[PDB]
Design a protein around this nucleic acid. Sequence first.
DNA 1: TTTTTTTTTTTTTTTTTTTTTTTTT
DNA 2: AAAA
Lengths: 646, 268
Amino acid sequence: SLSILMLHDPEARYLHKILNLLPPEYYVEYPLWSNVVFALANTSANYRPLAEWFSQKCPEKWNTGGKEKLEKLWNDASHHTEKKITKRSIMYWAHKHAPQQYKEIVEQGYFSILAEYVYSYNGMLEHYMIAKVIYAMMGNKFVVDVDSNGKYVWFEFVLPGQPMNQGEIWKWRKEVNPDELHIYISENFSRVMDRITEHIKYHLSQPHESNILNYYKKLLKAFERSKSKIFNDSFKKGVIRQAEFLFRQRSFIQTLDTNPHLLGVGNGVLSIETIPAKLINHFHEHPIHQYTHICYVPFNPENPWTKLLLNALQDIIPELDARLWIMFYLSTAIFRGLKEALMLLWLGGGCNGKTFLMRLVAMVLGDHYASKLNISLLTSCRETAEKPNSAFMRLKGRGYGYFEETNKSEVLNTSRLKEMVNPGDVTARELNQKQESFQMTATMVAASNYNFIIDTTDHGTWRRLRHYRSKVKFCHNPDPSNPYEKKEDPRFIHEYIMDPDCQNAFFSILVYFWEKLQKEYNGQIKKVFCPTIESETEAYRKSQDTLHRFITERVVESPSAETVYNLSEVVTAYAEWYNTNINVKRHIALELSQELENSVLEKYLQWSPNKTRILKGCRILHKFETLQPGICEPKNKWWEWSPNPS
Amino acid sequence: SLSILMLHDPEARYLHKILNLLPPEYYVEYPLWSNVVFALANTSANYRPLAEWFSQKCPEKWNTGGKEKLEKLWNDASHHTEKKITKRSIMYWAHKHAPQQYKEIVEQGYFSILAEYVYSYNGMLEHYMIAKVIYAMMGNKFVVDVDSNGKYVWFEFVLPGQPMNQGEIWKWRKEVNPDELHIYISENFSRVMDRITEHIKYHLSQPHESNILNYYKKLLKAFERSKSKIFNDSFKKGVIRQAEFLFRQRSFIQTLDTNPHLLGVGNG
DNA sequence: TTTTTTTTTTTTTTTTTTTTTTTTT
DNA sequence: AAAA
Ligand SMILES: Nc1ncnc2c1ncn2[C@@H]1O[C@H](COP(=O)(O)OP(=O)(O)OP(O)(O)=S)[C@@H](O)[C@H]1O
Ligand SMILES: [Mg+2]
């Protein structure tokens, strides 16, 4: 039904004019004829005859390649979507390979549209007809959408070779007013206007009877009076008001920045969807707007900065397995999608260089994807009633959260922490607006030289937690006796972050590590057995437990004795214990009404017939009360990751 | 390809005219000449042949000097990010060393621009024409940028010889509305209006065929009717609301006062 | 727990309109 | 000179 499409849509025929400029080898290329049929698939569905016409377009080997081959990709499912290239991109392949003939095709294209309107209304232009001409001419560059509060917001696609803020190439940007459209409607639209002027004068040159003696003269007078209308301001404001509907595109704002496999970079957009990661520095159709100003380059260990960073980094963390495991964890900061609930906190001392690593990642990732949050938030000690809260926000879309030191060692209640790590959704509010929910997908790190008090026993609480301790410390007198001591550079933090190449080198390392973990056991973090890690963590679990310490301080090593009333004094005995052993405090005592049974006291803990859980015997201690009776060091390179054991 | 240089771009031919009347002693010297090479290189990369011809202004340096070194300098300036010294500076040296000649050159330039618009639209001026003509002159001052709050903001370059605040000289200042731009467009633009009127009446003086019996009469009537528009409040407000698009400079507010090696003082 | 966020603006007209002199009756 |  080629004729059908021809008559059904003049644009379809124009679209046919433009597709005739494609060389036959384009139709030969297997992934390309799949691309074009998919591109037309997402734009309407009645173009099956046109798609079938494309099967007969340069069919030098259609029978050789299979008659039921190109149509099969569309006839198998006229429904269904793939989130692929739509229209307004086929024009890009058309003009990138067939110049000149493309510019005249579009030139006569809107020329017919404009010349139709000038004849139909005796040369009396208006706002809407101009808006239609503009959209058919530069409708493949602008998108208008409506935000949450509701205004007609303008988004512009940046192209190389035009004034633009650094790092904002090959991606959409927000515009308060389409300013460059205002100059565009005044300069390039004039050229279209002139072609009309020549056409009417040429027809006036050809003699004829009264049908042209006054009719052409009237239009010329009307047209010239209307020629100056375009330069007016209120008229130009009206055209922008009209064109808002033509450039309207439903479902564009909420699909912005949704793909977690696309990252905006200073030299295009970086795709981590497939291995290896690929850089896009040409036209595409992915709705991405946020970015960071760090240019991406392929990972080269031969760069002096890459070696410089790797050497200092390797010295910072001595253990090979710990070094691999930590950076693999930090490599997830590039990802912006759902992540497994892992909390990383680790201990150090003095000028340990902890601040250097967090600071490096934050600027490398950029503000759009990384941010600094109040350390108090981690404590979770603070509670928020029905009141605005801002620091809870800012976590949207981010993939990295880093903290700093506290006043001292701090206690962290499970509340306000369970939802900070879990792959769930949380809701809150702040200045203005109201309650709203947002998916949390950011990696979390918080290291300090202060131990974090944890008062619980639940496995679910102590399953999304990992602990580490630093061992290498920096001092200005590095005696050559202790390996855990190295010299410092004041420039190392004050500068070396201001060098863009350092960020470019560091970002490459992060990309490479994420590729390694992805090429590793299908992602995930639970694997990679680092004996140094997860052992100090459970050692920290054997510590940081007041009850267990109390158990093997007063009742254990003296269980054969018998000074027991009930669960009541055991709490008081535990109360006075932590009062001195730790600090004086009180609790709604029901926690031990079951935790004590959850403990190892069952040897003597047996509930009496009238409940009271009378322990079979212990010795409450007063006065001194003693004598109571009861890895491979890497050869030369470790970023190469070594074989599977590593 | 000098003909290609002078063909595709009237801005290039204007830069050709400005490139003349220069003190070639500076071109002979390495520092200042390299500085102006950097200035022109930072202003787009499409002007590679024009920069090459700038190497052939007083060709002695291109015949006695680092030819390949100079072209490599221009190339690296094109593909590097620096402080980005731009135009409106070579204009400064041209005015500094060479008064007179440049004044009538720019006068003829924007006068020709306005005359071209008048002849194109039968002397029916409109806000865009006046806005572009105004941007053709001035331009050095009046940088416009969009704040973080979404409000257009105007900035003026303070110069000696005006009523300014204390210690505000030789640096940008914030302006709620370009008031002295308003009075400038009211006063100085009238000189161009008068020059155009004189040119029209002079052409009317010369005798010709039936064109002058009615056609110049129509042109002069339309121009006279449009003359009073520049004094209208709504017309001038529209002219400003059109012109702030042209004087827009991307990435200006956030890069303001960023340099820690520069201090603002009373005497500069 | 006010406190400051909330309130409460806050743009608020503006364009235009009319005419528009010329034109052409 | 008056109406569009
Ligand atoms: N890999 C490295 N190479 C060279 N110098 C380093 C390295 N790591 C740390 N340093 C030096 O040691 C210092 C870093 O320690 P600090 O940042 O002071 O300690 P921190 O644990 O990060 O937290 P602070 O700052 O002590 S509260 C810097 O002054 C660096 O000069
Ligand atoms: Mg530090």
